[PDB]
Amino acid sequence: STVTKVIHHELEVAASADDIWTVYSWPGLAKHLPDLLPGAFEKLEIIGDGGVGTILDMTFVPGEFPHEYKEKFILVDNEHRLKKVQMIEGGYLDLGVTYYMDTIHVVPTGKDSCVIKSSTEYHVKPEFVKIVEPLITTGPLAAMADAISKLVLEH
Numbered sequence: 001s002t003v004t005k006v007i008h009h010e011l012e013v014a015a016s017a018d019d020i021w022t023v024y025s026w027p028g029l030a031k032h033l034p035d036l037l038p039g040a041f042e043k044l045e046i047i048g049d050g051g052v053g054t055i056l057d058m059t060f061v062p063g064e065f066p067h068e069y070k071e072k073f074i075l076v077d078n079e080h081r082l083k084k085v086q087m088i089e090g091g092y093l094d095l096g097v098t099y100y101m102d103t104i105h106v107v108p109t110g111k112d113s114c115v116i117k118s119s120t121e122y123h124v125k126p127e128f129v130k131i132v133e134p135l136i137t138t139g140p141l142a143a144m145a146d147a148i149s150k151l152v153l154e155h
């Protein structure tokens with residue numbers, strides 16, 4: 001057995017869903033993640049063209065937990081503006097977690113408005129629930145949402 005946990009974040013953004021989705025689905029996004037989020041990375045290696053199936057090997061500078069993990073783009077759905085990115089090696093998988101999936105859904109609210117609905121689902125062995133609970137937060141998805149919003153809006 002494992003236990004399933006799901007955590008959620010929303011950001012309202014004063015830009016269209018189309019504009020926001022342009023950035024989340026840009027095939028160059030992975031390779032530019034260090035520009036988008038400066039000072040995070042020690043190393044970033046990308047296998048793939050940025051579309052579905054791309055693997056990102058991410059190593060973070062000392063003092064960051066986790067230190068390294070591999071991520072894979074599982075879904076990049078233009079019709080529903082839905083992105084799924086799986087932690088496939090390392091990271092929380094070395095802390096009793098057997099499944100880790102980030103979902104990002106860009107939902108239109110108005111002509112020039114949308115909500116970025118980010119969530120994390122993980123499956124954890126029961127004896128590890130207490131250990132991973134404070135470590136797995138929406139922090140990284142909220143950081144990405146904040147930075148994408150700012151990149152679209154700010155002049």
Ligand SMILES: COc1ccc(CCNCCc2ccc(O)c(O)c2)cc1
Pocket residue numbers: 024029030033034037040056071085102140141144
């Ligand atoms: C420094 O920036 C980071 C951004 C996000 C994370 C969490 C893992 N990423 C989950 C969603 C995601 C990851 C990579 C992508 O290229 C992407 O488009 C979407 C880590 C670091």
